[model samples]
Target: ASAWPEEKNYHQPAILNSSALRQIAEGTSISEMWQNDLQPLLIERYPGSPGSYAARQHIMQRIQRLQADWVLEIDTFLSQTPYGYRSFSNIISTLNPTAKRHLVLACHYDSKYFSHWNNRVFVGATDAAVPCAMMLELARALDKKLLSLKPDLSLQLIFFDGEEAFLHWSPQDSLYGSRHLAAKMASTPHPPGARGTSQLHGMDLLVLLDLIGAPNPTFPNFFPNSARWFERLQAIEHELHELGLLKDHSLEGRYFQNYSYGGVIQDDHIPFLRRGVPVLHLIPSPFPEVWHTMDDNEENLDESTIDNLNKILQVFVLEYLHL
Candidate 1:
């Protein structure tokens, strides 16, 4: 086994540093931010609230930042351009070149265009922003740690740009980013001299994280082949619970229902699963009432929830890579 970096040890305090948590708490407005940073870049301007456009632009800028900051090259393939559905995949390779198997962790960053609640603004804090930020934190942590571990897998953190739609509900409208990526991955050739003839086999495991930083977070059971993986995740959960790091409500008390079949969610994972990658969908089904609404802001997210998630993921990666 390769020596892992000390940074790989993701502790709650380190993961949820005060500055990061404060940024999460500051509350981000997509429309306002977009008018400020993105409207100038677009040749053809679309009419909408600054917040709506800001959300879209935020995703694009975030993709650029990830590539530049992590020293990861970006390959942009499109079913559509900046607006009509976009996908951003950030790759962080290990020091040893042989590490080719992939572990994909993803989250959708788009806020709903239409609001379900009385408020018109769709801040999407817990619905997606919090999860997106959490994923970024994980990416940073993993990048630092993987430099030492020499894990057998290559990790890709995908930040999907269009998992939501303008309408309240529509099958075709949803999952746009995922659909495009799946199709793109299927059609595209693998990197030069890759072991396999096809590019599809690069992925080994896929994990999707959505709506994760709610007051009380619960991940539904995994799909069949992923059940064993779920057990592994549960072990991490238990460890956190014992350490008193997890929130009190999240404990599996007598009244806690297993809620295995928590209804099918047509999220980003569907596309990867269709492409033959075994996926673990980490989501909180029947989301909190504030989901997709303005109230879904940072006020609804609990630090403990983020802490528990960060800790569990850190342990999972360390063990999976046998660091």
Candidate 2:
């Protein structure tokens, strides 16, 4: 039996016109973030290592520099892993902390652990450096616009640490940060007079990014519940390309499609999704060509693709918030 969903009733999202979307694309510059945030994050950030510390510090400092009012929350906890209990921190940045609902953008900042001496300097640029940088760019680019709207739906970014497994990828070893954060959010009740029962309940959607940065990256629709939101991304991509807003890069079919037939790639979203939180997984399936390799470094990253994706996400955040 196929795992893909049968076509039925689905919510159709409203498409923003080309001009308006182009206007929304302003203030987002991939080059700016490339050096500021992405460069610092491209390190061997595995667990509690020094590289990890540098990575976390860079992310926090970048959030601190945002012109908009972003409330930063740190979730630090210890979880048992293959190498014993290790500390994992998930950086949570919110535009409006008191907003009734939230739209979450997430990615893992931790790079994989390699014992070999030659591979010790492995930096996960596409494994997540690009996604993390994009998130920062999204916050900075849309800060004023989001702040001006003062909408009920707020934008939140989660930079998850310890997403890489120590030895092998397993439920017990992988996703330490996400697993801890999801449970904490689920059990921790929202403040008094809040709309939802718990912090997790207030999350309207979780857009998880991973394995991006390759020249021609593609994403497939995974969850049936968030399929409409996925289509929204596809629509944004189509309009941006048609309007000639993207770079000089030619079309390689659509970057977003229904290519996944019920296959789910396990990552940080699994814990949140299991708790019934709506999710739009943005990681490219079949993974990046240099995934988990030392070769996934700065030279391999395509600036054109990163710039285009940065604009696409900015529009997505704006439209999702109805701003």
Candidate 3:
């Protein structure tokens, strides 16, 4: 996809406020983490609730506001189940909606808890609310710049629903939205001779973010083959650290662990990986203690962590875009 061409515009890199790294996790600019009254979001946002839909709408509204400035094409993919109805969507404002080759940056928006444990009313904040928030953050910050530059490769931000287990985490239980989308993507035939260069044939790179927004979190590259691209992310983090823009984090992120500690945890990326797509999983293994617990709330979010990773991503994307 790198060979894809652009209009050849000499452009400066997109400027980002290093200070924002600490702020979004603090709920400063993130409305979804806070209630309408601007209080800490304590209410449960489990799927199928008014609160969940409200949060979804909140994300939708933020993306919708950009249409006037950026060419946006937002589409929803719905899947029905005995549990009720679910929606999957590709929320992006880019050069073209139907590009053969594209890059997908994604996260799951749904939060979950077992019917008995925690009573099924859980917010799943760091479990993913922050991931959702960060995706929105990236889209808001980069959409216009990306659209104007109009690079050869297409870029899209995806917000998926129902990533958590319904009854339990199992082959059939988890990753509902991704499985559905991947199946549809798998069935769609690529343009002849374009077999290995489109999203369906794993031509697209899938960067999945989860378990972010925690203090001193460390991400291990679960895939050894993608180590080169993975190391570039670490280098970016180090650059930010040296600039003093990012807080000093003693714990460094890792790569090539090959699930040594995590043992290849399942996630939305699994569906795509199964179909031979290149995947980069940015989740910290030995997950934070608050993982899947009621304590995974707004109070637990690490501002420095979110701020640092956000900036790393910001720079990494620019490098990827060749800005």
Candidate 4:
């Protein structure tokens, strides 16, 4: 059978001016997030590892701090890895569980495992720590507003586990959690008396974040179905830069360029995209120089870039939820 096709949601998003954007972005601090949230996540968090459980615990603890009681669903299952059948869990948090539609923001929380390299101490800061941290910060920044406004589309944050293959990267080895969760969601029915609409069908868009928090990162438009939303992200970047809200004024050009980079990187979004989910993949091509290495640590991250990306995401969530 053929997979579901991508359909673009082309309508005017509730746009916010510079002042409101700035106000929403200013309260969230990248530095504090780095020290508290990101730092704790800097460990080898491959599934079934000590750090993996710790990483999951940290994310759950953070979610508890949210102003609104976001419904949390944990997808726990066992996938056959090259090594063995390893247990994996995906975190699904929703702001308004009763809402009919959802805007999903997601990233992989699992880090690559290197048995030989750095004594198996790969933290994967830019690989995904930054992306996960940004998602948490976004939740903190907009929790109250989302509750108050009760926008048309509810916000859902998914932290996918076992995204990294235990051995070599391939169709069979990679994306264990996402693949499993996508299938489960597709089969499950939505709670409200919505006939024939599965949980997967409730998704309006899936904005997947990866390999961010590094300096000089560029986001290329990947999916044709989501190009309109991608351009909206670019516009937000430009607006933030023009407003002087972004710290690095010296940085030439904006991060979200109009150029459509060819091809796609196999990550967590592949499963959802294949199931007809419109995805905005916010990952830089030609990935950061320190990718998948010991150098991809906290010290290597660019503060200004982290701050800028965090702010952009905050505003994106604000406008998307119309909060």
TM-score of each: 0.69, 0.92, 0.77, 0.94
What is candidate 3's lDDT per residue for 1-323, written digit by digit as tens?
54432221232234334554333223223343233311222455555666656666676677677532445544467666547666545444444545555567788777774454545356777778777777666666555556565434556677666788776677766787788777776776543355344446534567889877777676777775455557777766665665565655642342223333437688989988888777788888768888887778778877656756766776666566654
Name the TM-score of candidate 4: 0.94
How would you encode candidate 4's per-residue C-alpha lDDT over 57-130 as one tens digit per residue?
A: 99988988877778888889998889887799899888778766788999999999887564646789998999
Model 1 local distance difference test score: 0.54
Once fitted onto the true fold, the runs of candidate 2 whose alpha carbons sit more than 4 angstroms away are: 1-15, 149-151, 191-196
Number of the top TM-score candidate: 4
How many clashing pairs in candidate 1?
4
Extract clashing residue pairs from model 1. Answer: 30-51, 31-50, 31-51, 34-54
Given candidate 4, what's the lDDT at residue 133?
A: 91
Question: Total clashing residue pairs per candidate?
Answer: 4, 0, 1, 0
lDDT of 2: 0.81
Residue 194 lDDT in candidate 3: 59
